[PDB]
Design an enzyme around this catalytic site. Structure first.
Site, PDB file in Angstrom:
ATOM      1  N   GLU A  11       0.803  -1.229   0.000  1.00 15.74           N
ATOM      2  CA  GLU A  11       0.000   0.000   0.000  1.00 15.74           C
ATOM      3  C   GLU A  11       0.836   1.279   0.000  1.00 15.74           C
ATOM      4  O   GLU A  11       0.344   2.304  -0.414  1.00 15.74           O
ATOM      5  CB  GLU A  11      -0.921   0.060   1.265  1.00 15.74           C
ATOM      6  N   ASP A  20      -6.187   6.794  -4.937  1.00 11.08           N
ATOM      7  CA  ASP A  20      -5.737   5.411  -4.947  1.00 11.08           C
ATOM      8  C   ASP A  20      -5.879   4.852  -6.381  1.00 11.08           C
ATOM      9  O   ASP A  20      -6.195   5.610  -7.305  1.00 11.08           O
ATOM     10  CB  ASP A  20      -6.501   4.597  -3.894  1.00 11.08           C
ATOM     11  N   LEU A  32      -8.764   4.443   2.987  1.00 15.28           N
ATOM     12  CA  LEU A  32      -9.730   5.087   2.111  1.00 15.28           C
ATOM     13  C   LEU A  32     -10.578   6.080   2.926  1.00 15.28           C
ATOM     14  O   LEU A  32     -11.232   5.700   3.916  1.00 15.28           O
ATOM     15  CB  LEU A  32     -10.614   4.011   1.492  1.00 15.28           C
ATOM     16  N   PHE A 104      -8.401  -6.204   3.538  1.00 11.39           N
ATOM     17  CA  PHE A 104      -7.981  -4.831   3.715  1.00 11.39           C
ATOM     18  C   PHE A 104      -8.164  -4.035   2.433  1.00 11.39           C
ATOM     19  O   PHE A 104      -8.533  -2.894   2.485  1.00 11.39           O
ATOM     20  CB  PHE A 104      -6.505  -4.813   4.133  1.00 11.39           C
ATOM     21  N   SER A 117     -13.203 -19.621  -5.404  1.00 14.72           N
ATOM     22  CA  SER A 117     -11.833 -19.604  -4.896  1.00 14.72           C
ATOM     23  C   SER A 117     -11.779 -19.970  -3.409  1.00 14.72           C
ATOM     24  O   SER A 117     -10.872 -20.674  -2.954  1.00 14.72           O
ATOM     25  CB  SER A 117     -11.187 -18.221  -5.070  1.00 14.72           C
ATOM     26  N   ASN A 132      -8.015 -19.791 -10.299  1.00 14.63           N
ATOM     27  CA  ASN A 132      -9.339 -19.168 -10.218  1.00 14.63           C
ATOM     28  C   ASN A 132      -9.232 -17.722  -9.690  1.00 14.63           C
ATOM     29  O   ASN A 132     -10.020 -16.838 -10.082  1.00 14.63           O
ATOM     30  CB  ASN A 132     -10.244 -20.021  -9.333  1.00 14.63           C
TER      31      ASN A 132
END
EC number: 3.2.1.17
Length: 164
Positions: A11, A20, A32, A104, A117, A132
């Site tokens: 990040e 972002d 965010l 996250f 998945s 997948n």
């Protein structure tokens, strides 16, 4: 290597509001602020989140405090979700960190939509889950980051993150 160090790699750290990968206002380590197009809305959310009149710049200590709260929220969100909690309970500690990484980034609702998945992960079909997982908007939009997360699930090691 642990989740705090992995996320800081994935990040980065910025002490002034920025946009972002999707164009949303963001600060600190991937925190965010708002999905609105208004930088004034974003500054007001920052002031509410930090508890003072900031004007768009925070300190490092403030950014770490937001990051600790967000990692905590992501874990607590997994353990309260009925699709995520059994997957998390089935994994080893390294693969659990990979799941916290996705939550996250995309939030608890988005990760919980990877139905097929998650079933493969619970079955420990690592190579098939990796294929997948890559058939996704997430992988096409942020492929370098998604590859590191997917490798973590495939191998159960932190190898994708050493050498960074």
């Amino acid at each position: 290597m642990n989740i705090f160090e992995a996320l800081r790699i994935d990040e980065g750290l910025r002490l002034k509001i920025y946009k972002d990968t999707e164009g949303y206002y963001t600060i600190g380590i991937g925190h965010l602020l708002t999905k609105s197009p208004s930088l004034n809305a974003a500054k007001s959310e920052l002031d509410k989140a930090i508890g003072r009149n900031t004007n768009g710049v925070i300190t490092k200590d403030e950014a770490e405090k937001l990051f600790n709260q967000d990692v905590d929220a992501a874990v607590r969100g997994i353990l309260r979700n009925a699709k995520l909690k059994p997957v998390y309970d089935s994994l080893d500690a390294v693969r659990r960190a990979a799941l916290i990484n996705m939550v996250f980034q995309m939030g608890e609702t988005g990760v919980a939509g990877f139905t097929n998945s998650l079933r493969m992960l619970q079955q420990k079909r690592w190579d098939e889950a990796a294929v997948n997982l890559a058939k996704s908007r997430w992988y096409n939009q942020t492929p370098n980051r998604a590859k590191r997360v997917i490798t973590t699930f495939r191998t159960g090691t932190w190898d994708a993150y050493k050498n960074l």
